[PDB]
Amino acid sequence: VNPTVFFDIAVDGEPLGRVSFELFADKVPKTAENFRALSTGEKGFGYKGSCFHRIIPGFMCQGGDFTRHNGTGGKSIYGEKFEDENFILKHTGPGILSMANAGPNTNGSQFFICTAKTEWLDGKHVVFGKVKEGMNIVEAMERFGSRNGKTSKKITIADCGQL
Template identity: 90%
Template sequence: LRRARHPDECLLLCSCLAMANPQVFFDIAANGEPLGRVTFELFADKVPKTAENFRALSTGEKGFGYKGSCFHRIIPGFMCQAIRHSGKSIYGEKFPDENFILKHTGPGILSMANAGPNTNGSQFFICTAKTEWLDGKHVVFGRVKEGMNVVEAMERCGSKDGKTSKKITITDCGQLS
């Protein structure tokens, strides 16, 4: 970095830094044994309300969040799904689909689980494959930035019906940037 030569240059730099997408982490365990850390980039530049819901639930700053929650449904070759204990979002029970700009392009995509249109809460899933049939139905809001090996280890604990062979828990979570 270099010093700004003009106040407008400083403003431009500050606004670009402010627009950086947040990163959050989950520390994951299987039956209490650590599997590792998964880091997510949240696409606040495309779906700010959805990204903010996940970010705030990751930090627990509203008095509730993902810490201690489980991945209750894991289907190998499809996805790993989790929910905060009550299923409630930071906006109340449910909030509307923000948009469907982003697509389910492959492993590592982070998307909202729902019970139909405009029923987003705290339930989400991590794709372990391309799932284009979900486009236009589930809001994509992030991606795995690091720790896909941890997601793959989680996936090995799943089954065709989604039941897990081990209890997959978010032991800690928070914001990195």
Template identity: 65%
Template sequence: MSKLSAMTAALVLATSAAPAFAENPKVAMDVSIAGEPAGTITLELFADVTPKTADNFRALCTGEKGEDLSYAGSPFHRIIPGFMIQGGDFTNGNGTGGKSIYGEKFADENFELGFTGPGQLAMANAGPNTNGSQFFITVAKTPWLSGKHVVFGKVVDGMDVVKTMEQQGSRSGRTRSDVVLESCRQL
């Protein structure tokens, strides 16, 4: 075997033996509006780009870190039509609370992904490096948020549910009816 053939064979063997990237995790959120089931939103979490942020959200969906660290039963407290739906405050339910699996707050992981259209999942925050549990899903293109909020996932199914939720919002963000994340799980 020539040196070139041996090197080519070694390269092929090395690349074929290398582990493939695991698939990004997906979670499902069951939502109710005014106490009635509204449907399920399925989200892909970009663990390949934002592993720490994605794992925080995934663990809060499963509740695996304990009952006090779970999205189950928490409201979508802020919905602005033409902009976004926001939830994740499972401590106070009004946008003033929440916490991460890493403690109260954690740093912005990166801003590699920008806001390019509806259905993007991002961390809500009160300024740089103040991520906790609150998140939002965009219902429109919001490029002005790029570099300010960490995008870590996207809606892969259930955008119709997001649009139904959007109809419960107002310009102030106050919801017309209770919109609740009833249960959440990893798929």
């Protein structure tokens, strides 16, 4: 059964709400497992305490850099980066959860949540889940983004785990 994980989001340390994701282990098992384990922190490291560093209204919310906390870092549970598993699933609309990268086969821990359809990313970013509850939390994060993605407040994953 596809696992479910949650983020408790805070804004400048003030609680905002919880968002939960279905991870498509049935179609991308290796990529879902990476996100799952990073959400539980069971490898000794993961998303807890990291921030969404790039939020662009009309497009997406991006985060996941827990190694450098400056938008350039993050790592997977398989080593620093791992290959593109597949591109079966498409960026079909709001709530799609997908891997950020710096070119082919550079998946780490950074991810993004679509707030709209982003079809021009299909085949270049590995889609591996979707928001299951709390899309309105993601929408609420948009109001702290900007045109180039810089945020006006600190949007953190205050807690996370598996449901």
